[PDB]
Amino acid sequence: GFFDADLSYPTVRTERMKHKRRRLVQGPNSYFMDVSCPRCRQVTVVYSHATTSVECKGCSKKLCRPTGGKALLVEGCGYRRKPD
Amino acid sequence: TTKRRNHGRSKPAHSRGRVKPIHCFNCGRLTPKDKAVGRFVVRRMLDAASARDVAEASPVYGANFPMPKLYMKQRFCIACAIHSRTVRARPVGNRKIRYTRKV
Amino acid sequence: MTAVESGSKVLRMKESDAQKLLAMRCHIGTRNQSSAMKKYIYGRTAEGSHIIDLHMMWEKLILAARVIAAVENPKDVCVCSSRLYGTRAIYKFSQHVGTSFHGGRFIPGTFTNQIQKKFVQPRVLVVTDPRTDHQAIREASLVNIPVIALCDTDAPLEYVDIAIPCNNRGIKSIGMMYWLLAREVLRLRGTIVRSVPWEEKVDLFFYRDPN
Amino acid sequence: MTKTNGQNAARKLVRLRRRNRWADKGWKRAHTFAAKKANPFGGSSHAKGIVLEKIGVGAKQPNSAIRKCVRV
Amino acid sequence: TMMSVLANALRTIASAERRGKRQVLIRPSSKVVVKFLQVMQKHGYIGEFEIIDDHRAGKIVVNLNGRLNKCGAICPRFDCATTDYEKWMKNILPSRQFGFVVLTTSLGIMDHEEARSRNTGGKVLGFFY
Amino acid sequence: GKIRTKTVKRASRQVVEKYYSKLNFDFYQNKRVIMDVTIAESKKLKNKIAGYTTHIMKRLARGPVRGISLKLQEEERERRMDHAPATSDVDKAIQSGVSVDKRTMQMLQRLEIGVPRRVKRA
Amino acid sequence: TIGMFNEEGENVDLYIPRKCHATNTLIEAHDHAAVQISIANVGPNGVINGTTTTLCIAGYLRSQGESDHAINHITIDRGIMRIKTGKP
Amino acid sequence: EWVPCTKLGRLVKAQKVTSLEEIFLFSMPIKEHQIVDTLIAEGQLHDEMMKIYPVQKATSAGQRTRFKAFNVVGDCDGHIGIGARVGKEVSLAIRASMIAAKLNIVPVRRGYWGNKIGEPHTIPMKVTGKCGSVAVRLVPAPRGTGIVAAPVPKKILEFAGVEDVYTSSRGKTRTHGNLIMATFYALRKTYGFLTPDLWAETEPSRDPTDEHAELLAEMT
RNA sequence: CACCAUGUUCAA
RNA sequence: AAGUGUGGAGAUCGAAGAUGAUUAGAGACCAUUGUAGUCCACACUGCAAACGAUGACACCCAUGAAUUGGGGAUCCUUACGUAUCUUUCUCAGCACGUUUUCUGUUUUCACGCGAAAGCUUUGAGGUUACAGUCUCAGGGGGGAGUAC
Ligand SMILES: *O[C@H]1[C@H](O)[C@@H](N)[C@@H](O[C@H]2[C@H](O[C@@H]3O[C@H](CO)[C@@H](O[C@H]4O[C@@H](CN)[C@@H](O)[C@H](O)[C@H]4N)[C@H]3O)[C@@H](O)[C@H](N)C[C@@H]2N)O[C@@H]1CO
Ligand SMILES: [Mg+2]
Ligand SMILES: [Mg+2]
Ligand SMILES: [Mg+2]
Ligand SMILES: [Mg+2]
């Protein structure tokens, strides 16, 4: 307590909880990640909420599976989130 | 004068259109299932004086093996619940008390 | 209110003061939580109890003392407790500071019914609980009496102006908040000096079951 | 839930009022012709007539008399 | 659907000011609703406000200073001649001493007092007092 | 031989206030006091006052009676109660350690005074 | 210079009333929950001076429960009560 | 004589509180009707009975009957008060409403329609006040209008010091119990509206019971 | 859970 | 829902009707029956206390338990806390716990409102300080939802 809410400059605790369109400026929730294939090893860029099933262009295999929210990457694959 | 919000029955405004009625337990009156007051009774078959006569003359039943009972789920008409004194008229401030379990 | 006009650190909590608060468990809140006391909570512990921020406890404690020490004729402060654990502490705070005190059933009309012969007109009311002293607060709403309260984590803060956050439940925890407030109001007046410890024992503030 | 604004909504407001004036029993009696064609005076006052017979009309409850009146 | 954005903005200011708030968040905004607020700043009924840029319509955070009683919007924007200012003052304002009727004129968006002095007329937008 | 009227009960408490030392657990001696300390005309009430007085003398042997206002047993026990040990219950609480919780200790790092001495983490 | 004048510059109204320090709400004569709270200005040695800071709160603000949030917001602004701990 | 019980009446009897606007400033309840006729001069304070009507309670064996009396009080210089008490005899309830109307005394802000040239002729802004369904609306009028009101609000507005006013009334005004107390609630709101005269910051004062706390303890 | 229908006109 | 037409069906309950009984009378309730109906197919009707006695679409709106479906984590502060138990196949699974958040049905609870009962982010609030948009109905009780 003792700090009042400023509506122009809201707290990081208050603002991280909000819905993505209920933010002060709305924005994405998703991101891109650089997924390495489990065999074959070549990197692919996979969207976090990929409803399509992305294929490895080298491996020929499918290293993603759609869900209701975030898509699930296959077992044994490595991934690190890309910036921006 | 709306005597009670929810209007006597468990149906809110935008939830159900209708609920199909059940017959009353002794009257046979068709009342909706959410309106009609519903008690699940676990009544024993024999009184404890009468059960002691039967448990003594029983090879099966004793202090170890308990005697069965009746499990019947009665549902009453609102005329039928007041008259059998299952339910009673309560004071105006006292009507909102709701019991979620058998006391 | 530990901020003076010059900028000194004279009113601030010290490692001796906060060590007393931890020993008397007057920073543990109850399991429940209200909206108005939600800003005074630091976090929740395991077993689901609320921990009160000792900064905000001390800042609202000294703020209530800067209001009581700014009362000439200290009998215009009335300190009152309907709960039984307060009544011994209410007596000893009234003894060292010199305020009116009342305990037990509040007897409605004490603040409003002017032809009663138990009719008092305090200027500042100090209630031990906002909840069990609902009747003392609700008559203060009628005759212009601001209210100081020892609030727990779920306190109804309608008509409470300076809500002190503490543990007003336990016998030791209560009375430690009245020792420490009586210890402080005497310092702001200049009766006792801030260097030496106040020799008077806290034990007389504790309620003791005379049967 | 009552009426309409709109800068170009005057035809709606003119039609809306001309139908709701017919519900006024003073406006409807002043603008229909069953008012005078069924009035025994021809939409006028003080009409002459010929006395036919004398009637005693008994008063309504709670009063009790017979009111002396003629049929003309 | 939302029809009048200015009528939306003044209704959320007036509602949050009778609740005694310190700030409002106004969504959406326009060029009209910021030119209405700058009339309310010049006669000191509101404080500093801030327009946040989306690439959408913006949002405005207005700092309230307790002075505004009621701001509202007259819908539809009735045409008001120069002879008609004393008619609009008696209808929507509480007194002739204080209170302003904001008009959109050819010269700009002004209150009623400035527009009487510059001998102009306009369509009425709203009021604040 | 039923409930005593408030005329009997209010007067009987006043006999116990003003004349506690002259009264004991017997009826027939407490009656003789109340004839000298109460100026009423009825012998029926003075029998009932000496009955309820005798009753609230047996109640004062046990403990406190509400509304009795005896003011010397209350002045004595207020002096016997206001007695404290030389070592405070807070000074004996620090001298073993205060033993705060996880969340509390995680708060006490944040303060401008730090974590106080004679503390533990439990 | 507060209250209405005459065009002769004499203060015409009786009783310029108080205003709430939280909500700028003009305190009426029958608003019997409206309180003044005097906070003692204190010196460098921790003993009170002869001057007090007085803040007055309207009656509806106490009625809702929002007075205690308002006394905090005022005394941080006046500089009476500190907003946070110093760094350890 | 009159022995006071409240601290305000002790200070009024001691002439420590000298005027009535020193009570209105600190929102103090009066609680004693001898405060008002002490502070207001005796010849400059008028009162007369608005309405007296009987109210009945059905009991076993008949009706109970008590008379509810309305009184208005105030010098015609911005002070008004209305009280409504009841009683078995009509003489008691008239006397009790006099006691009641002084306790409810309250100030009236008055202002100007156009230019400001003397004492205020009118109320400073449009104001309504509602009791029951009867809400009266009081509108500022020009300098030489007069009170344009029904004769029950007109007698109240004369005692409040308002010289020129327009008045409306929205519903069931033949109920005078709520018509009287709606003119009172509307004139009471005249110091509730924050105008740009009163935007300025005023320096805080001390309560008469704060300042004279040493004197009031000497009565004990 | 047998049966248990009704009380002229104003007025006090 | 009753009702209608043409075919099926026809167990049970059952307007009409029939017998008992109660009753002063009983054309009623109660008991025994029993036709049309109940049920299906294809047509017709469009008459509900078709209700939340509350038109639709937006806006603002305080609080604390819950619940359903989806998703995500485990001088006004520059950030942070994770348990339980079932687990050879619609199994990288299922349920739970703490916390976020969107959508829905609600509940005891701050303003405010109302003649009141009561309503209250689910408005009947934001209204004589009366204008977000559109729409339907009402104008004392009847006659009469009648006559043409
Ligand atoms: O969409 C929700 C909204 O974002 C949020 N404001 C929330 O409000 C409450 C929240 O209330 C609900 O409590 C429910 C549990 O009893 C919980 O529902 C949820 O339950 C979880 C477990 N099944 C989830 O898995 C589930 O998806 C979810 N529906 C909350 O919704 C409280 O828990 C908070 N303490 C306070 C928040 N203000 O409610 C909105 C939907 O009701
Ligand atoms: Mg239905
Ligand atoms: Mg007959
Ligand atoms: Mg029978
Ligand atoms: Mg049959």
PDB file of all heavy atoms in Angstrom, chain C residues 13 15 19 27 42 44-45 51-52 88 201 203 208, chain F residues 81-82 88-89 94 101 103-104 107 110 113 117-118, unseen atoms left out:
ATOM      1  N   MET C  13      10.794   3.655  13.275  1.00  0.00           N
ATOM      2  CA  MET C  13      10.862   2.384  13.976  1.00  0.00           C
ATOM      3  C   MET C  13      12.309   1.956  14.126  1.00  0.00           C
ATOM      4  O   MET C  13      13.126   2.157  13.232  1.00  0.00           O
ATOM      5  CB  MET C  13      10.060   1.341  13.206  1.00  0.00           C
ATOM      6  CG  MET C  13      10.031  -0.035  13.785  1.00  0.00           C
ATOM      7  SD  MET C  13       8.966  -1.104  12.817  1.00  0.00           S
ATOM      8  CE  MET C  13       9.919  -1.273  11.324  1.00  0.00           C
ATOM      9  N   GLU C  15      15.172  -1.111  15.771  1.00  0.00           N
ATOM     10  CA  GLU C  15      15.293  -2.561  15.852  1.00  0.00           C
ATOM     11  C   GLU C  15      14.877  -3.079  17.217  1.00  0.00           C
ATOM     12  O   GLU C  15      14.680  -4.280  17.391  1.00  0.00           O
ATOM     13  CB  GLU C  15      16.723  -2.996  15.550  1.00  0.00           C
ATOM     14  CG  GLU C  15      17.729  -2.553  16.596  1.00  0.00           C
ATOM     15  CD  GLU C  15      19.140  -2.974  16.270  1.00  0.00           C
ATOM     16  OE1 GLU C  15      19.345  -3.606  15.213  1.00  0.00           O
ATOM     17  OE2 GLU C  15      20.044  -2.674  17.075  1.00  0.00           O
ATOM     18  N   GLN C  19      11.322  -5.489  17.316  1.00  0.00           N
ATOM     19  CA  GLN C  19      11.601  -6.772  17.940  1.00  0.00           C
ATOM     20  C   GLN C  19      10.529  -7.112  18.961  1.00  0.00           C
ATOM     21  O   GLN C  19      10.284  -8.284  19.256  1.00  0.00           O
ATOM     22  CB  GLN C  19      12.982  -6.685  18.568  1.00  0.00           C
ATOM     23  CG  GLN C  19      13.646  -7.915  19.043  1.00  0.00           C
ATOM     24  CD  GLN C  19      15.050  -7.584  19.487  1.00  0.00           C
ATOM     25  OE1 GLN C  19      15.453  -6.425  19.466  1.00  0.00           O
ATOM     26  NE2 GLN C  19      15.805  -8.590  19.864  1.00  0.00           N
ATOM     27  N   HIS C  27       1.744  -8.708  14.258  1.00  0.00           N
ATOM     28  CA  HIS C  27       1.845  -8.495  12.828  1.00  0.00           C
ATOM     29  C   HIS C  27       1.176  -9.607  12.043  1.00  0.00           C
ATOM     30  O   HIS C  27       1.152  -9.551  10.815  1.00  0.00           O
ATOM     31  CB  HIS C  27       3.305  -8.385  12.423  1.00  0.00           C
ATOM     32  CG  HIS C  27       4.070  -9.649  12.604  1.00  0.00           C
ATOM     33  ND1 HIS C  27       4.198 -10.586  11.604  1.00  0.00           N
ATOM     34  CD2 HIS C  27       4.705 -10.158  13.681  1.00  0.00           C
ATOM     35  CE1 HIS C  27       4.906 -11.605  12.050  1.00  0.00           C
ATOM     36  NE2 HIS C  27       5.225 -11.372  13.309  1.00  0.00           N
ATOM     37  N   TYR C  42       1.411  -7.493   3.742  1.00  0.00           N
ATOM     38  CA  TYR C  42       2.620  -7.723   2.965  1.00  0.00           C
ATOM     39  C   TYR C  42       2.458  -8.951   2.086  1.00  0.00           C
ATOM     40  O   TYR C  42       2.619  -8.882   0.864  1.00  0.00           O
ATOM     41  CB  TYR C  42       3.831  -7.883   3.872  1.00  0.00           C
ATOM     42  CG  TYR C  42       5.107  -8.045   3.084  1.00  0.00           C
ATOM     43  CD1 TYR C  42       5.682  -6.958   2.454  1.00  0.00           C
ATOM     44  CD2 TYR C  42       5.738  -9.276   2.971  1.00  0.00           C
ATOM     45  CE1 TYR C  42       6.840  -7.085   1.730  1.00  0.00           C
ATOM     46  CE2 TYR C  42       6.903  -9.412   2.247  1.00  0.00           C
ATOM     47  CZ  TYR C  42       7.445  -8.310   1.628  1.00  0.00           C
ATOM     48  OH  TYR C  42       8.604  -8.414   0.901  1.00  0.00           O
ATOM     49  N   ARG C  44       0.921 -13.446   2.300  1.00  0.00           N
ATOM     50  CA  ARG C  44       0.227 -14.494   3.026  1.00  0.00           C
ATOM     51  C   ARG C  44       1.240 -15.575   3.360  1.00  0.00           C
ATOM     52  O   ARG C  44       2.093 -15.902   2.532  1.00  0.00           O
ATOM     53  CB  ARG C  44      -0.938 -15.051   2.209  1.00  0.00           C
ATOM     54  CG  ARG C  44      -1.819 -16.016   2.964  1.00  0.00           C
ATOM     55  CD  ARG C  44      -3.010 -16.475   2.145  1.00  0.00           C
ATOM     56  NE  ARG C  44      -2.628 -17.277   0.989  1.00  0.00           N
ATOM     57  CZ  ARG C  44      -2.822 -16.919  -0.276  1.00  0.00           C
ATOM     58  NH1 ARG C  44      -3.399 -15.763  -0.568  1.00  0.00           N
ATOM     59  NH2 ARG C  44      -2.437 -17.723  -1.254  1.00  0.00           N
ATOM     60  N   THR C  45       1.173 -16.095   4.577  1.00  0.00           N
ATOM     61  CA  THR C  45       2.066 -17.169   4.967  1.00  0.00           C
ATOM     62  C   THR C  45       1.436 -18.524   4.666  1.00  0.00           C
ATOM     63  O   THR C  45       0.270 -18.627   4.285  1.00  0.00           O
ATOM     64  CB  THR C  45       2.410 -17.082   6.451  1.00  0.00           C
ATOM     65  OG1 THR C  45       3.436 -18.029   6.743  1.00  0.00           O
ATOM     66  CG2 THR C  45       1.226 -17.433   7.290  1.00  0.00           C
ATOM     67  N   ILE C  51       0.259 -11.456   6.635  1.00  0.00           N
ATOM     68  CA  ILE C  51       1.360 -10.773   7.293  1.00  0.00           C
ATOM     69  C   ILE C  51       1.218  -9.292   6.994  1.00  0.00           C
ATOM     70  O   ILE C  51       1.007  -8.899   5.841  1.00  0.00           O
ATOM     71  CB  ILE C  51       2.718 -11.310   6.824  1.00  0.00           C
ATOM     72  CG1 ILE C  51       2.789 -12.818   7.033  1.00  0.00           C
ATOM     73  CG2 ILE C  51       3.838 -10.646   7.582  1.00  0.00           C
ATOM     74  CD1 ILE C  51       2.645 -13.249   8.455  1.00  0.00           C
ATOM     75  N   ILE C  52       1.314  -8.479   8.017  1.00  0.00           N
ATOM     76  CA  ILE C  52       1.086  -7.053   7.877  1.00  0.00           C
ATOM     77  C   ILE C  52       2.430  -6.356   7.719  1.00  0.00           C
ATOM     78  O   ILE C  52       3.412  -6.713   8.374  1.00  0.00           O
ATOM     79  CB  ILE C  52       0.302  -6.539   9.093  1.00  0.00           C
ATOM     80  CG1 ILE C  52      -0.997  -7.309   9.238  1.00  0.00           C
ATOM     81  CG2 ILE C  52      -0.085  -5.104   8.919  1.00  0.00           C
ATOM     82  CD1 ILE C  52      -1.662  -7.078  10.545  1.00  0.00           C
ATOM     83  N   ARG C  88      -8.514  -4.480  30.066  1.00  0.00           N
ATOM     84  CA  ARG C  88      -7.395  -4.190  30.952  1.00  0.00           C
ATOM     85  C   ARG C  88      -6.417  -3.225  30.298  1.00  0.00           C
ATOM     86  O   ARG C  88      -5.877  -2.335  30.962  1.00  0.00           O
ATOM     87  CB  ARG C  88      -6.708  -5.491  31.353  1.00  0.00           C
ATOM     88  CG  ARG C  88      -5.544  -5.307  32.282  1.00  0.00           C
ATOM     89  CD  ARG C  88      -5.982  -4.725  33.602  1.00  0.00           C
ATOM     90  NE  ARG C  88      -4.844  -4.533  34.492  1.00  0.00           N
ATOM     91  CZ  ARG C  88      -4.897  -3.866  35.638  1.00  0.00           C
ATOM     92  NH1 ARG C  88      -6.034  -3.316  36.033  1.00  0.00           N
ATOM     93  NH2 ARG C  88      -3.807  -3.739  36.383  1.00  0.00           N
ATOM     94  N   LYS C 201       6.302  -1.806  32.736  1.00  0.00           N
ATOM     95  CA  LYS C 201       6.202  -3.129  32.140  1.00  0.00           C
ATOM     96  C   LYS C 201       4.949  -3.221  31.290  1.00  0.00           C
ATOM     97  O   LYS C 201       3.946  -2.572  31.588  1.00  0.00           O
ATOM     98  CB  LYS C 201       6.178  -4.220  33.212  1.00  0.00           C
ATOM     99  CG  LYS C 201       7.409  -4.344  34.116  1.00  0.00           C
ATOM    100  CD  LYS C 201       8.642  -4.966  33.451  1.00  0.00           C
ATOM    101  CE  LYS C 201       9.661  -3.932  32.977  1.00  0.00           C
ATOM    102  NZ  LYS C 201      10.909  -4.550  32.472  1.00  0.00           N
ATOM    103  N   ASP C 203       3.199  -5.895  31.071  1.00  0.00           N
ATOM    104  CA  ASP C 203       2.387  -7.002  31.577  1.00  0.00           C
ATOM    105  C   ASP C 203       1.057  -6.532  32.143  1.00  0.00           C
ATOM    106  O   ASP C 203       0.081  -7.286  32.148  1.00  0.00           O
ATOM    107  CB  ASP C 203       3.157  -7.745  32.659  1.00  0.00           C
ATOM    108  CG  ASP C 203       4.405  -8.384  32.138  1.00  0.00           C
ATOM    109  OD1 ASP C 203       4.448  -8.700  30.936  1.00  0.00           O
ATOM    110  OD2 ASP C 203       5.340  -8.581  32.932  1.00  0.00           O
ATOM    111  N   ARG C 208      -6.278 -10.584  32.283  1.00  0.00           N
ATOM    112  CA  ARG C 208      -6.072 -11.776  33.102  1.00  0.00           C
ATOM    113  C   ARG C 208      -7.354 -12.173  33.836  1.00  0.00           C
ATOM    114  O   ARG C 208      -7.460 -11.798  35.006  1.00  0.00           O
ATOM    115  CB  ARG C 208      -5.009 -11.457  34.111  1.00  0.00           C
ATOM    116  CG  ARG C 208      -3.775 -12.296  34.166  1.00  0.00           C
ATOM    117  CD  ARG C 208      -3.087 -12.022  35.509  1.00  0.00           C
ATOM    118  NE  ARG C 208      -3.259 -10.639  35.969  1.00  0.00           N
ATOM    119  CZ  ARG C 208      -2.529  -9.603  35.559  1.00  0.00           C
ATOM    120  NH1 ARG C 208      -1.556  -9.778  34.675  1.00  0.00           N
ATOM    121  NH2 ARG C 208      -2.774  -8.388  36.034  1.00  0.00           N
TER     122      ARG C 208
ATOM    123  N   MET F  81      -4.358  -7.274  41.770  1.00  0.00           N
ATOM    124  CA  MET F  81      -4.186  -7.661  40.376  1.00  0.00           C
ATOM    125  C   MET F  81      -3.105  -6.844  39.679  1.00  0.00           C
ATOM    126  O   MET F  81      -2.352  -7.381  38.859  1.00  0.00           O
ATOM    127  CB  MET F  81      -5.513  -7.522  39.627  1.00  0.00           C
ATOM    128  CG  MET F  81      -5.498  -8.134  38.255  1.00  0.00           C
ATOM    129  SD  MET F  81      -5.245  -9.911  38.402  1.00  0.00           S
ATOM    130  CE  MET F  81      -6.836 -10.440  39.004  1.00  0.00           C
ATOM    131  N   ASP F  82      -2.991  -5.556  40.000  1.00  0.00           N
ATOM    132  CA  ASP F  82      -1.998  -4.680  39.376  1.00  0.00           C
ATOM    133  C   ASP F  82      -0.621  -4.937  39.986  1.00  0.00           C
ATOM    134  O   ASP F  82      -0.052  -4.118  40.711  1.00  0.00           O
ATOM    135  CB  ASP F  82      -2.403  -3.221  39.525  1.00  0.00           C
ATOM    136  N   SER F  88       9.777  -8.488  32.204  1.00  0.00           N
ATOM    137  CA  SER F  88       8.575  -8.418  31.393  1.00  0.00           C
ATOM    138  C   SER F  88       8.410  -9.683  30.559  1.00  0.00           C
ATOM    139  O   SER F  88       9.370 -10.403  30.271  1.00  0.00           O
ATOM    140  CB  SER F  88       8.619  -7.203  30.472  1.00  0.00           C
ATOM    141  N   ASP F  89       7.163  -9.949  30.164  1.00  0.00           N
ATOM    142  CA  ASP F  89       6.890 -11.073  29.279  1.00  0.00           C
ATOM    143  C   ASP F  89       7.384 -10.823  27.864  1.00  0.00           C
ATOM    144  O   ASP F  89       7.494 -11.773  27.084  1.00  0.00           O
ATOM    145  CB  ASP F  89       5.396 -11.383  29.256  1.00  0.00           C
ATOM    146  N   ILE F  94      12.082 -12.116  23.869  1.00  0.00           N
ATOM    147  CA  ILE F  94      13.280 -11.884  23.070  1.00  0.00           C
ATOM    148  C   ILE F  94      14.434 -12.762  23.540  1.00  0.00           C
ATOM    149  O   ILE F  94      15.155 -13.347  22.719  1.00  0.00           O
ATOM    150  CB  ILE F  94      13.641 -10.387  23.070  1.00  0.00           C
ATOM    151  CG1 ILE F  94      12.742  -9.613  22.102  1.00  0.00           C
ATOM    152  CG2 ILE F  94      15.101 -10.152  22.763  1.00  0.00           C
ATOM    153  CD1 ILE F  94      11.507  -9.011  22.641  1.00  0.00           C
ATOM    154  N   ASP F 101       8.434 -16.416  10.798  1.00  0.00           N
ATOM    155  CA  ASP F 101       8.012 -17.333   9.756  1.00  0.00           C
ATOM    156  C   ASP F 101       8.859 -17.110   8.493  1.00  0.00           C
ATOM    157  O   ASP F 101       9.802 -16.321   8.489  1.00  0.00           O
ATOM    158  CB  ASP F 101       6.516 -17.110   9.533  1.00  0.00           C
ATOM    159  CG  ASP F 101       5.842 -18.234   8.795  1.00  0.00           C
ATOM    160  OD1 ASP F 101       6.537 -19.191   8.401  1.00  0.00           O
ATOM    161  OD2 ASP F 101       4.612 -18.163   8.623  1.00  0.00           O
ATOM    162  N   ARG F 103       7.522 -15.953   5.402  1.00  0.00           N
ATOM    163  CA  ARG F 103       7.089 -14.700   4.789  1.00  0.00           C
ATOM    164  C   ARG F 103       7.512 -13.497   5.620  1.00  0.00           C
ATOM    165  O   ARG F 103       7.905 -12.465   5.066  1.00  0.00           O
ATOM    166  CB  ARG F 103       5.574 -14.715   4.596  1.00  0.00           C
ATOM    167  CG  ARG F 103       4.993 -13.431   4.039  1.00  0.00           C
ATOM    168  CD  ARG F 103       5.414 -13.162   2.615  1.00  0.00           C
ATOM    169  NE  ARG F 103       4.860 -14.156   1.709  1.00  0.00           N
ATOM    170  CZ  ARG F 103       5.179 -14.256   0.427  1.00  0.00           C
ATOM    171  NH1 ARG F 103       6.032 -13.396  -0.109  1.00  0.00           N
ATOM    172  NH2 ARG F 103       4.624 -15.194  -0.325  1.00  0.00           N
ATOM    173  N   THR F 104       7.474 -13.632   6.946  1.00  0.00           N
ATOM    174  CA  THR F 104       7.868 -12.540   7.828  1.00  0.00           C
ATOM    175  C   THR F 104       9.354 -12.236   7.707  1.00  0.00           C
ATOM    176  O   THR F 104       9.741 -11.070   7.592  1.00  0.00           O
ATOM    177  CB  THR F 104       7.515 -12.887   9.269  1.00  0.00           C
ATOM    178  OG1 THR F 104       6.109 -13.124   9.376  1.00  0.00           O
ATOM    179  CG2 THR F 104       7.896 -11.758  10.188  1.00  0.00           C
ATOM    180  N   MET F 107      10.089 -10.499   4.614  1.00  0.00           N
ATOM    181  CA  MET F 107       9.748  -9.085   4.736  1.00  0.00           C
ATOM    182  C   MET F 107      10.821  -8.298   5.474  1.00  0.00           C
ATOM    183  O   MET F 107      11.133  -7.165   5.092  1.00  0.00           O
ATOM    184  CB  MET F 107       8.413  -8.931   5.458  1.00  0.00           C
ATOM    185  CG  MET F 107       7.967  -7.495   5.661  1.00  0.00           C
ATOM    186  SD  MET F 107       6.392  -7.368   6.509  1.00  0.00           S
ATOM    187  CE  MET F 107       6.844  -7.880   8.147  1.00  0.00           C
ATOM    188  N   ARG F 110      13.567  -6.406   3.866  1.00  0.00           N
ATOM    189  CA  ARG F 110      13.248  -5.217   3.088  1.00  0.00           C
ATOM    190  C   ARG F 110      13.291  -3.927   3.892  1.00  0.00           C
ATOM    191  O   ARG F 110      13.255  -2.849   3.294  1.00  0.00           O
ATOM    192  CB  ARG F 110      11.857  -5.330   2.464  1.00  0.00           C
ATOM    193  CG  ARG F 110      11.769  -5.980   1.091  1.00  0.00           C
ATOM    194  CD  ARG F 110      12.037  -7.459   1.112  1.00  0.00           C
ATOM    195  NE  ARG F 110      11.684  -8.070  -0.162  1.00  0.00           N
ATOM    196  CZ  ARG F 110      11.923  -9.337  -0.476  1.00  0.00           C
ATOM    197  NH1 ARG F 110      12.536 -10.128   0.389  1.00  0.00           N
ATOM    198  NH2 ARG F 110      11.554  -9.810  -1.657  1.00  0.00           N
ATOM    199  N   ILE F 113      15.677  -0.926   8.752  1.00  0.00           N
ATOM    200  CA  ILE F 113      16.395  -1.359   9.941  1.00  0.00           C
ATOM    201  C   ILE F 113      16.956  -2.761   9.800  1.00  0.00           C
ATOM    202  O   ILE F 113      17.702  -3.210  10.683  1.00  0.00           O
ATOM    203  CB  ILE F 113      15.457  -1.288  11.155  1.00  0.00           C
ATOM    204  CG1 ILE F 113      14.281  -2.231  10.948  1.00  0.00           C
ATOM    205  CG2 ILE F 113      14.945   0.116  11.325  1.00  0.00           C
ATOM    206  CD1 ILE F 113      13.426  -2.392  12.154  1.00  0.00           C
ATOM    207  N   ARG F 117      18.153  -8.059  15.824  1.00  0.00           N
ATOM    208  CA  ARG F 117      18.906  -9.048  16.576  1.00  0.00           C
ATOM    209  C   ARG F 117      17.955  -9.893  17.417  1.00  0.00           C
ATOM    210  O   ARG F 117      16.792  -9.530  17.630  1.00  0.00           O
ATOM    211  CB  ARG F 117      19.951  -8.379  17.467  1.00  0.00           C
ATOM    212  CG  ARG F 117      21.070  -7.699  16.696  1.00  0.00           C
ATOM    213  CD  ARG F 117      22.225  -7.311  17.598  1.00  0.00           C
ATOM    214  NE  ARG F 117      21.861  -6.330  18.613  1.00  0.00           N
ATOM    215  CZ  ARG F 117      21.930  -5.014  18.446  1.00  0.00           C
ATOM    216  NH1 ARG F 117      22.352  -4.511  17.296  1.00  0.00           N
ATOM    217  NH2 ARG F 117      21.577  -4.204  19.433  1.00  0.00           N
ATOM    218  N   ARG F 118      18.484 -11.023  17.903  1.00  0.00           N
ATOM    219  CA  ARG F 118      17.742 -12.041  18.658  1.00  0.00           C
ATOM    220  C   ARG F 118      16.524 -12.532  17.876  1.00  0.00           C
ATOM    221  O   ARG F 118      15.388 -12.465  18.344  1.00  0.00           O
ATOM    222  CB  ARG F 118      17.339 -11.531  20.048  1.00  0.00           C
ATOM    223  CG  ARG F 118      18.205 -11.965  21.236  1.00  0.00           C
ATOM    224  CD  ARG F 118      19.144 -13.125  20.932  1.00  0.00           C
ATOM    225  NE  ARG F 118      18.690 -14.392  21.502  1.00  0.00           N
ATOM    226  CZ  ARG F 118      18.824 -14.740  22.777  1.00  0.00           C
ATOM    227  NH1 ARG F 118      19.409 -13.918  23.636  1.00  0.00           N
ATOM    228  NH2 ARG F 118      18.377 -15.915  23.193  1.00  0.00           N
TER     229      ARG F 118
END
